[PDB]
Amino acid sequence: AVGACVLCNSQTSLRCGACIRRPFLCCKCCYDHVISTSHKLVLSVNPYVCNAPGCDVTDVTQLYLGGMSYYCKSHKPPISFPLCANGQVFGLYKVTDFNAIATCDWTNAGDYILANTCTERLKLFAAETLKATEETFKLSYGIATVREVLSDRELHLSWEVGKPRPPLNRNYVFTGYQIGEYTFEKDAVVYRGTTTYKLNVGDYFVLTSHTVMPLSAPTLVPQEHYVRITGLYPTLNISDEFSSNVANYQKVGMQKYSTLQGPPGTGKSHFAIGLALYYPSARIVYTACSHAAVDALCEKALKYLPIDKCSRIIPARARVECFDKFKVNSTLEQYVFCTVNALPETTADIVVFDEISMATNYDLSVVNARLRAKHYVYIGDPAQLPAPRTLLTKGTLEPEYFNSVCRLMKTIGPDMFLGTCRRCPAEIVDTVSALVYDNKLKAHKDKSAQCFKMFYKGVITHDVSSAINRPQIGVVREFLTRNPAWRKAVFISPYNSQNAVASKILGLPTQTVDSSQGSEYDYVIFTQTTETAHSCNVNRFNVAITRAKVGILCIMSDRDLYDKLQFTSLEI
Numbered sequence: 001a002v003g004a005c006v007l008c009n010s011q012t013s014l015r016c017g018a019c020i021r022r023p024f025l026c027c028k029c030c031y032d033h034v035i036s037t038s039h040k041l042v043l044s045v046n047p048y049v050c051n052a053p054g055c056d057v058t059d060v061t062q063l064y065l066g067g068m069s070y071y072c073k074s075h076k077p078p079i080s081f082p083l084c085a086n087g088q089v090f091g092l093y094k095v096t097d098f099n100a101i102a103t104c105d106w107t108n109a110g111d112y113i114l115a116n117t118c119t120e121r122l123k124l125f126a127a128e129t130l131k132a133t134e135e136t137f138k139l140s141y142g143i144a145t146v147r148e149v150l151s152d153r154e155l156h157l158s159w160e161v162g163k164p165r166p167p168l169n170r171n172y173v174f175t176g177y178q179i180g181e182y183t184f185e186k187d188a189v190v191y192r193g194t195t196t197y198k199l200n201v202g203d204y205f206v207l208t209s210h211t212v213m214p215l216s217a218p219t220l221v222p223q224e225h226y227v228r229i230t231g232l233y234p235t236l237n238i239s240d241e242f243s244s245n246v247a248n249y250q251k252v253g254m255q256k257y258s259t260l261q262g263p264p265g266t267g268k269s270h271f272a273i274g275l276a277l278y279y280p281s282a283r284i285v286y287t288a289c290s291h292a293a294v295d296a297l298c299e300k301a302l303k304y305l306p307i308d309k310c311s312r313i314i315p316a317r318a319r320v321e322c323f324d325k326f327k328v329n330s331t332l333e334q335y336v337f338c339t340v341n342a343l344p345e346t347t348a349d350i351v352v353f354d355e356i357s358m359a360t361n362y363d364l365s366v367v368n369a370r371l372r373a374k375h376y377v378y379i380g381d382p383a384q385l386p387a388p389r390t391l392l393t394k395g396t397l398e399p400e401y402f403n404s405v406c407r408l409m410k411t412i413g414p415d416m417f418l419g420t421c422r423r424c425p426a427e428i429v430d431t432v433s434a435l436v437y438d439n440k441l442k443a444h445k446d447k448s449a450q451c452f453k454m455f456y457k458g459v460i461t462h463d464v465s466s467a468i469n470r471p472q473i474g475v476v477r478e479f480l481t482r483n484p485a486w487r488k489a490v491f492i493s494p495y496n497s498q499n500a501v502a503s504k505i506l507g508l509p510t511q512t513v514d515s516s517q518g519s520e521y522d523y524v525i526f527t528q529t530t531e532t533a534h535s536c537n538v539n540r541f542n543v544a545i546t547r548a549k550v551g552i553l554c555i556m557s558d559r560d561l562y563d564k565l566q567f568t569s570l571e572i
């Protein structure tokens with residue numbers, strides 16, 4: 001039990017026994033913690049507990065030292081010093097924010113605000129504590145058991161009594177029993193095995209609670225600015241395609257780390273892959289939280305970089321189908337594409353972390369711990385969607401609080417900004433530029449005259465809490481008959497239950513706003529479904545309308561966002 005203080009690094013024998021992570025706290029900090037919170041169990045070699053037989057005094061403020069032993073006020077010998085005196089807790093080698101991180105239930109937005117405005121070591125304490133709290137919460141849900149097997153994609157489930165039922169969306173991944181990971185959608189339920197298996201009756205499913213490893217590396221390394229490009233060797237022969245990013249690629253070699261804010265369709269993949277063509281000898285590890293973000297980087301690399309110098313790292317516990325054109329699990333290749341949780345312990349000349357709004361501080365820290373690099377480039381957009389915070393139910397998490405990188409991009413600004421959207425028709429670019437980009441995003445395409453908006457509240461029904469608006473889907477069905485070109489549109493809504501209804505009624509492929517992020521489609525049909533804080537989130541709204549290359553039909557519930565859409569209004 002010999003470690004360093006999470007608040008001031010001072011070496012100590014003390015750990016908080018009431019904290020779920022049991023942080024090492026020094027004499028002067030440990031006191032400031034026990035004296036201000038319900039946390040009174042202090043751990044050393046032995047806990048600070050009354051040594052008198054059958055005594056239940058564990059509160060450090062009610063204990064004293066009797067020689068080399070610990071006793072309460074009722075058992076202490078005449079010659080005994082209190083454990084808590086003069087701003088310190090007795091220990092070898094002799095905070096308001098730490099108390100709030102240590103005691104909070106992570107259900108308030110203010111908990112996440114603090115976990116991002118605090119000191120660097122407190123961001124790791126916050127990130128570990130949050131993730132451990134999120135896992136112990138997965139145990140609170142009831143066990144689903146197979147009652148009947150309808151077919152290869154449908155079954156009926158028997159839930160546990162006394163324990164609540166977890167939300168049934170793709171976000172919540174189950175573990176069958178060890179028959180593989182499984183997912184559910186809406187008494188006929190749709191089952192989806194990450195592995196194909198003849199669903200047996202009696203088999204059960206649990207949300208896999210994974211052990212939270214402690215954090216060691218910071219979320220962001222200390223910034224270093226250099227007079228020249230360091231450890232990287234630029235080409236003089238640089239393809240005209242990537243000439244627009246040359247000044248920014250040099251900025252990347254003259255700093256330890258750099259932030260790139262790239263609104264939708266401004267060239268993030270192009271910038272990331274073009275950085276390899278600019279430093280041709282440099283080993284680049286490409287990382288992101290999701291398999292789809294890593295796969296999008298592989299698709300752009302397949303087009304510009306040699307396939308023999310690339311490798312897609314796939315964890316043996318495969319959950320979804322990912323990129324198959326590179327040699328798999330060769331961490332020895334010059335270009336390594338890998339999700340954060342699968343990263344090996346290696347080194348790199350450049351580390352590119354894409355879709356930075358989806359990262360948590362836990363992920364930022366894991367990347368710094370597994371990858372030791374000369375340069376780190378963080379690419380994403382704080383105006384796009386963050387990682388879901390399953391415990392957060394009160395308050396809204398603002399972009400400057402998503403993670404350390406997003407905090408920097410929203411306060412000091414990003415080091416680099418891609419200001420030209422090449423994907424969207426001008427109507428959409430002008431709407432999101434004013435909405436989330438402070439009028440700094442510019443349109444490359446002209447107005448398509450195929451961006452429509454309809455103010456139609458319809459009727460809101462609910463599959464549990466996931467919302468449906470059948471009259472909004474009815475308006476879409478009516479529109480499709482009059483606009484058959486839109487037969488090829490992707491249907492998007494903020495709710496998976498709305499999507500299930502629209503899939504059966506319209507037959508269009510379906511995507512939630514959160515799963516559509518990073519993807520593009522010629523035509524998009526968006527139904528807002530509700531006027532909630534979720535369906536009105538400006539970041540979700542921004543993602544939803546920036547998926548479209550040619551046209552979009554927005555069936556709106558919120559007068560506010562409807563009025564902001566610079567689209568042609570439709571009647572009915």
Ligand SMILES: CCS(=O)(=O)NCc1ccc2c(c1)OCO2
Pocket residue numbers: 283331332333346347348
């Ligand atoms: C951080 C660089 S690395 O260790 O991942 N790649 C270098 C390398 C090492 C051994 C090899 C090889 C390439 O090809 C044959 O055997």
Ligand SMILES: [Zn+2]
Pocket residue numbers: 005006007008009010025026027028029030
């Ligand atoms: Zn301390």
Ligand SMILES: [Zn+2]
Pocket residue numbers: 016017018019033039102
């Ligand atoms: Zn504590």
Ligand SMILES: [Zn+2]
Pocket residue numbers: 050051052055056057071072073074075
């Ligand atoms: Zn006692």
